[PDB]
Short mmCIF file of C-alpha atoms in Angstrom, two decimals:
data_model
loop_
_atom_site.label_atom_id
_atom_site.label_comp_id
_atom_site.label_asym_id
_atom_site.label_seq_id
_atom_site.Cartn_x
_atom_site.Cartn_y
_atom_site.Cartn_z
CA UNK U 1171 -20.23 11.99 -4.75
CA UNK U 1172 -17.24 9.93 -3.42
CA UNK U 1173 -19.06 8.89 0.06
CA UNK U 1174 -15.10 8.64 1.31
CA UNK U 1175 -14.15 6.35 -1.47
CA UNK U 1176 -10.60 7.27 -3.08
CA UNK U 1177 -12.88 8.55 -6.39
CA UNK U 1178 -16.55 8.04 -7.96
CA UNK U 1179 -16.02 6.11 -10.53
CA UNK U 1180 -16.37 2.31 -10.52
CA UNK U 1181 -13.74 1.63 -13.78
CA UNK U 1182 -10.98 3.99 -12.36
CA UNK U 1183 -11.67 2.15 -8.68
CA UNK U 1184 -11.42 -0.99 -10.96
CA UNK U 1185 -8.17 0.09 -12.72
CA UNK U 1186 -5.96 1.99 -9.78
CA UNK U 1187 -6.76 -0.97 -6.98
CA UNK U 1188 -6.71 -4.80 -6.69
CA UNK U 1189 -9.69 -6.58 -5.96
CA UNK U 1190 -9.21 -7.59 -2.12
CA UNK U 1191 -9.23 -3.22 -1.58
CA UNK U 1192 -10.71 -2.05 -4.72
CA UNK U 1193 -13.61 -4.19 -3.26
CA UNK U 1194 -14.03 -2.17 0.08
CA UNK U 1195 -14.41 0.98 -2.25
CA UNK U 1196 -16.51 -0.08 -4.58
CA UNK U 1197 -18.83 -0.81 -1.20
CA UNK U 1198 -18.36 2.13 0.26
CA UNK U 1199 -19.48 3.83 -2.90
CA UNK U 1200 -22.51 1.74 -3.17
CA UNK U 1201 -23.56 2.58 0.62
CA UNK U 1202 -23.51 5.98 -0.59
CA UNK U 1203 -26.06 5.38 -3.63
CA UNK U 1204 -28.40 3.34 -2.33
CA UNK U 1205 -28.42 5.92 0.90
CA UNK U 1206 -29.79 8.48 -1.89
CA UNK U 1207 -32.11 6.29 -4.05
CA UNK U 1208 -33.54 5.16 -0.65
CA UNK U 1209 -34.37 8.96 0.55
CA UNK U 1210 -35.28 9.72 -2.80
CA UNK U 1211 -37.98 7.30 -2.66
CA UNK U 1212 -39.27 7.96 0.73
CA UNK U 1213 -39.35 11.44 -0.77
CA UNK U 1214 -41.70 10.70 -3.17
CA UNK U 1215 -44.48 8.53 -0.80
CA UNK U 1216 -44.30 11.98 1.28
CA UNK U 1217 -45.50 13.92 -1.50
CA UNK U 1218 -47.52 10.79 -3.06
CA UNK C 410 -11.00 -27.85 16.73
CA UNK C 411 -14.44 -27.58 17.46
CA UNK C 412 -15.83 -27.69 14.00
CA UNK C 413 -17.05 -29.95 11.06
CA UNK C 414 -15.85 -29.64 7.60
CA UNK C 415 -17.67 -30.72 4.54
CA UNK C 416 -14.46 -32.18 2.45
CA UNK C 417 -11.12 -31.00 3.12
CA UNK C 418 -8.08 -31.15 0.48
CA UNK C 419 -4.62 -30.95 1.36
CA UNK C 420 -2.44 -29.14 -1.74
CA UNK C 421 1.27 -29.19 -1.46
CA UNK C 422 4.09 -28.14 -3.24
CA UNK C 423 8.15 -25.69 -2.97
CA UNK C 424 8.49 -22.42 -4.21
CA UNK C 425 10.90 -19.63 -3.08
CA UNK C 426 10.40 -17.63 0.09
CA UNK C 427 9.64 -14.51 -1.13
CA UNK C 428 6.70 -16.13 -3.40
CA UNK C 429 4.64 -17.04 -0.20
CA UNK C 430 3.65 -14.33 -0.25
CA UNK C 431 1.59 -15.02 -3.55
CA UNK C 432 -0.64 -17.83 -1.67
CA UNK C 433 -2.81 -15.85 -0.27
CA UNK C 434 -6.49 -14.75 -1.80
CA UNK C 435 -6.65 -12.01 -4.26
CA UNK C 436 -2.71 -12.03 -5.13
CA UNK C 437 -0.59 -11.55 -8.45
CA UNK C 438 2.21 -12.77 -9.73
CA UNK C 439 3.97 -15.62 -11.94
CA UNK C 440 2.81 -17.94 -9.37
CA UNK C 441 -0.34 -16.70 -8.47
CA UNK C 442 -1.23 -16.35 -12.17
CA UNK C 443 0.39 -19.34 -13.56
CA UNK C 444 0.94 -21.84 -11.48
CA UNK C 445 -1.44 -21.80 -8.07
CA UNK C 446 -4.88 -19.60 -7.99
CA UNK C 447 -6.73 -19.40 -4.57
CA UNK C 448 -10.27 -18.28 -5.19
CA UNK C 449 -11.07 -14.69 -3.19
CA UNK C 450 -13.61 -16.28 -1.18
CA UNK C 451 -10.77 -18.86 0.16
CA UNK C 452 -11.71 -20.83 3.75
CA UNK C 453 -8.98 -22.78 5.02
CA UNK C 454 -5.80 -22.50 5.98
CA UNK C 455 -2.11 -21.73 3.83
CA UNK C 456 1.27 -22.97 5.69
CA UNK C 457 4.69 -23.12 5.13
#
């Protein structure tokens, strides 16, 4: 998933941007996955 | 004005007008690169 970042992968964010905006994507993208690993996890103390 | 400062340091030096644009945090170029780094997490103040 991109979460609105330009793409999902951190090495071509890292290679098509400089740091000062690369950084706001690679944050945005990082939102994004710990938004799943978070539900995933309060997924599994439901069905714990 | 209303603020204490830890240490301060005053850095000065000439380069071209169209170069300013290099001190700034996060920039590129032969000046940038070469000759005058800011760190990305600059505080302070650039002037010219």
């Amino acid at each position: 998933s991109n979460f609105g970042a330009i793409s999902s992968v951190l090495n071509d964010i890292l290679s098509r941007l400089d740091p000062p905006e690369a950084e706001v994507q690679i944050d945005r993208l990082i939102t994004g996955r710990l938004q799943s690993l978070q539900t995933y996890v309060t997924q599994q103390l439901i069905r714990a | 004005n209303d603020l204490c400062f830890t240490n301060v340091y005053a850095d000065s030096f000439v380069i071209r007008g169209d170069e300013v644009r290099q001190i700034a945090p996060g920039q590129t170029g032969k000046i940038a690169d070469y000759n005058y780094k800011l760190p990305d997490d600059f505080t302070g103040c650039v002037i010219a």
